[PDB]
Swiss-Prot record, chain A:
Organism: Rattus norvegicus (Rat)
Subcellular location field: Cell projection, Dendritic spine; Cell membrane; Synapse; Postsynaptic cell membrane
Binding site residues for L-glutamate: 102, 104, 109, 161-162, 203
Protein's name in the database: Glutamate receptor ionotropic, NMDA 2A
Subunit architecture: Heterotetramer. Forms heterotetrameric channels composed of two GluN1/zeta subunits (GRIN1), and two identical GluN2/epsilon subunits (GRIN2A, GRIN2B, GRIN2C or GRIN2D) or GluN3 subunits (GRIN3A or GRIN3B) (in vitro). Can also form heterotetrameric channels that contain at least two GluN1 subunits and at least two different GluN2 subunits (or a combination of one GluN2 and one GluN3 subunits) (in vitro). In vivo, the subunit composition may depend on the expression levels of the different subunits. Found in a complex with GRIN1, GRIN3A and PPP2CB. Found in a complex with GRIN1 and GRIN3B.
Effect listed in the UniProt record for changing residue 202 to F/L/M: Strongly decreased sensitivity to glutamate
Family to which the UniProt record says this protein belongs: Belongs to the glutamate-gated ion channel (TC 1.A.10.1) family. NR2A/GRIN2A subfamily.
Full-length numbering of the shown residues: 404 to 801 of 1464
Tissue-specific expression: Detected in brain cortex, olfactory bulb, hippocampus including the dentate gyrus, striatum, thalamus, superior colliculus, inferior colliculus, midbrain and cerebellum (at protein level). Detected in brain cortex, hypothalamus and cerebellum.
Taxonomic lineage from the root: Eukaryota, Metazoa, Chordata, Craniata, Vertebrata
Swiss-Prot record, chain B:
Function comment: Component of N-methyl-D-aspartate (NMDA) receptors (NMDARs) that function as heterotetrameric, ligand-gated cation channels with high calcium permeability and voltage-dependent block by Mg(2+). NMDARs participate in synaptic plasticity for learning and memory formation by contributing to the long-term potentiation (LTP). Channel activation requires binding of the neurotransmitter L-glutamate to the GluN2 subunit, glycine or D-serine binding to the GluN1 subunit, plus membrane depolarization to eliminate channel inhibition by Mg(2+).
One Gene Ontology molecular-function label: glutamate receptor binding
Residues that coordinate or bind glycine: 110, 112, 117, 166, 210
Keyword Signal annotated: yes
Compartment(s): Cell membrane; Postsynaptic cell membrane; Synaptic cell membrane; Postsynaptic density membrane
Listed name of the protein: Glutamate receptor ionotropic, NMDA 1
Section covered of the full-length record: 396 to 794 of 938
PTM statement from Swiss-Prot or TrEMBL: NMDA is probably regulated by C-terminal phosphorylation of an isoform of NR1 by PKC. Its phosphorylated state is influenced by the formation of the NMDAR-PPP2CB complex and the NMDAR channel activity.
Disulfide bridge map: 25-49, 41-50
Organism: Rattus norvegicus (Rat)
Superkingdom of origin organism: Eukaryota
Domain remark from Swiss-Prot or TrEMBL: A hydrophobic region that gives rise to the prediction of a transmembrane span does not cross the membrane, but is part of a discontinuously helical region that dips into the membrane and is probably part of the pore and of the selectivity filter.
UniProt note on tissues of expression: Detected throughout the brain, in brain cortex, cerebellum, thalamus and olfactory bulb.
Topological domain ranges for the Extracellular compartment: 141-272
Sites where a glycan is attached: 66, 86, 152, 249
Length: 273, 272
């Protein structure tokens, strides 16, 4: 009844601070001595944010206690040569019973972990400067960029699931856009705002959050109806976990009764439209 | 085996048309050249022709998981809510009742995933994300769910949803909707088509329903418009009994289909 749970910092879903008090919960982080050793120190941190508030509600509703820790090998979860790292890895290799955070439900992961119902919608979205007109990832402007002059300047953050999806579904688009690879989201926002980039293709929940709080409300996302590969963030559990049904029912109860919306208002909804 | 599939009439997810005289389904293509795959579905019973988003999905699921099927329309015409008997007993009506009683093995329809139903059945991961909105006739002007004509109701302005649907449940269960619910329960309709026709004939002034359906209706019938905004987000899922041997692979198939652009194709063919 007391559970090992893993998370990962990604504001505003999981925000990590030094030590707890207030709306925070304790979370430990194994911090390495250097990059040539496995030796390290457990450090006390405090965690808060959208997914942490969900966890607090689940612990209460589903009646469990937990020890929360931050993942240290990789991020959300990537399968390299059939070996998982990140939060998915922690669950797969039974170091955690549950993973909580901005964790995208997909087929590859669902083969090795169980997911709860989605608690936040996401997928592949597009962000542009206000005034630019595109429909979504499947727009011909993206699929056949040289059909236009000048061609659209657009990129994503490489090496993750967004790139992988585009590579699989739109091979020419993938080939074209690598020249506009962005190091991270923050770099991409600046590129858009300074006219160095026309569109940034990325995770919908993240782009919605960034657009919601952009300074001057100059950045815009497509409508949710044009999100490609719609899915959600979900809680990952061990395959055949006894906790899945009650976690599923609780999340559906939270959504149905307005609790999820007030969490969204609290953490995700920005001043812009 | 051979799975019994229950569905319901609900364009653009399920269209229902007469067979040709020889009992087959007429061959038809979309405006952009896509074949329209049709299956025989029995219903209120007479063999008929069914096609649309949910039918294309069923055919994909069938091929992927190698099952066969026979499709029928829900006998009572309802989605499914749980109601008291006579008794201390409760009973599900609609597609929910048919799944639970064994008259169907799978529900393939725009069935909203909610806590009430998930207590009793298993839902796949969502095959479609959408929400609730409001449909009115052009010339009717409301701000949406918080308009005073909704939050402060009278019989001068009539609004409603479909009986024995998830939307009915959504309004019954929340204390802060208690005033709205009391108005609606005097006016709810037997089906979405009837409520939509009623809005066109100025007999219903606002219809609260699934945005995937309402936005489609508004895009075909220029005398109808929606609020625009969703006031609640929800998903449609495939429904199975909790002992179903198919449930894991149905969900994986749905996730696979979102990721490989199959659902994108269905959205463009049927929903956009
Ligand atoms: N939510 C993250 C995915 C974010 C998008 P990516 O950086 O993989 O293109 C995850 O669960 O892996």
């Amino acid at each position: 009844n007391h559970l090992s749970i893993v998370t990962l910092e990604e504001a505003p879903f999981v925000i990590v601070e030094d030590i707890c008090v207030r709306n925070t919960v304790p979370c430990r982080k194994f911090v390495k001595i250097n990059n040539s050793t496995n030796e390290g120190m457990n450090v006390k941190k405090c965690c808060k944010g959208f997914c942490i508030d969900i966890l607090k509600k689940l612990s209460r509703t589903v009646k469990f206690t937990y020890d929360l820790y931050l993942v240290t090998n990789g991020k959300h979860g990537k399968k390299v040569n059939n070996v998982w790292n990140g939060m998915i890895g922690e669950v797969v290799y039974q170091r955690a019973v549950m993973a909580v955070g901005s964790l995208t439900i997909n087929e590859e992961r669902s083969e090795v972990v169980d997911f709860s119902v989605p608690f936040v919608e996401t997928g592949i979205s597009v962000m542009v400067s206000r005034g630019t007109q595109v429909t979504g990832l499947s727009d011909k402007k993206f699929q056949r960029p040289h059909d236009y002059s000048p061609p659209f300047r657009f990129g994503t953050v490489p090496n993750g699931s967004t790139e992988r999806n585009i590579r699989n579904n739109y091979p020419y688009m993938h080939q074209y856009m690598t020249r506009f690879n962005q190091r991270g989201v923050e770099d991409a926002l600046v590129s858009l705002k300074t006219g160095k980039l026309d569109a940034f293709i990325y995770d919908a929940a993240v782009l919605n959050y960034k657009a919601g709080r952009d300074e001057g409300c100059k950045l815009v996302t497509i409508g949710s109806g044009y999100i490609f590969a719609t899915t959600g963030y979900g809680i990952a559990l061990q395959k055949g976990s006894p906790w899945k049904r009650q976690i599923d029912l609780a999340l559906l109860q939270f959504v149905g009764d307005g609790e999820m919306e007030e969490l969204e208002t609290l953490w995700l909804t920005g001043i812009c439209h | 085996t051979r799975l019994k599939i229950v569905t319901i009439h609900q364009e653009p997810f399920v269209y229902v048309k007469p067979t040709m005289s020889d009992g087959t389904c007429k061959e038809e293509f979309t405006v952009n050249g896509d074949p329209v795959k049709k299956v025989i579905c029995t219903g209120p019973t007479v063999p008929q022709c069914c096609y649309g988003f949910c039918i294309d999905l069923l055919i994909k699921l069938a091929r992927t998981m190698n099952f066969t099927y026979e499709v029928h329309l829900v006998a009572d015409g309802k989605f499914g809510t749980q109601e008291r008997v006579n008794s201390n007993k409760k009973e599900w009506n609609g597609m929910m009742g048919e799944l639970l009683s064994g008259q169907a093995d799978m529900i393939v329809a725009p069935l909203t995933i909610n806590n009430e139903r998930a207590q009793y059945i298993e839902f796949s991961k969502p095959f479609k994300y959408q929400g609730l909105t409001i449909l009115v006739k052009k010339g009717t002007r409301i701000t949406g769910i918080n308009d005073p004509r909704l939050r402060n109701p009278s019989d001068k302005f009539i609004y409603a949803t479909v009986k024995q649907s998830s939307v009915d449940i959504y309004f019954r269960r929340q204390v802060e909707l208690s005033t709205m619910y009391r108005h609606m329960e005097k006016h709810n309709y037997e089906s979405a088509a009837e409520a939509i026709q009623a809005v066109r004939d100025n007999k219903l002034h606002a219809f609260i329903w699934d945005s995937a359906v309402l936005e489609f209706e508004a895009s075909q019938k220029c005398d109808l418009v929606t609020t625009g905004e969703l006031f609640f987000r929800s998903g449609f899922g495939i429904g199975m009994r909790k002992d179903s041997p198919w449930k894991q692979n149905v969900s994986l198939s749905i996730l696979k289909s979102h990721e490989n652009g199959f659902m994108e194709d269905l959205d463009k063919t049927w929903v956009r």
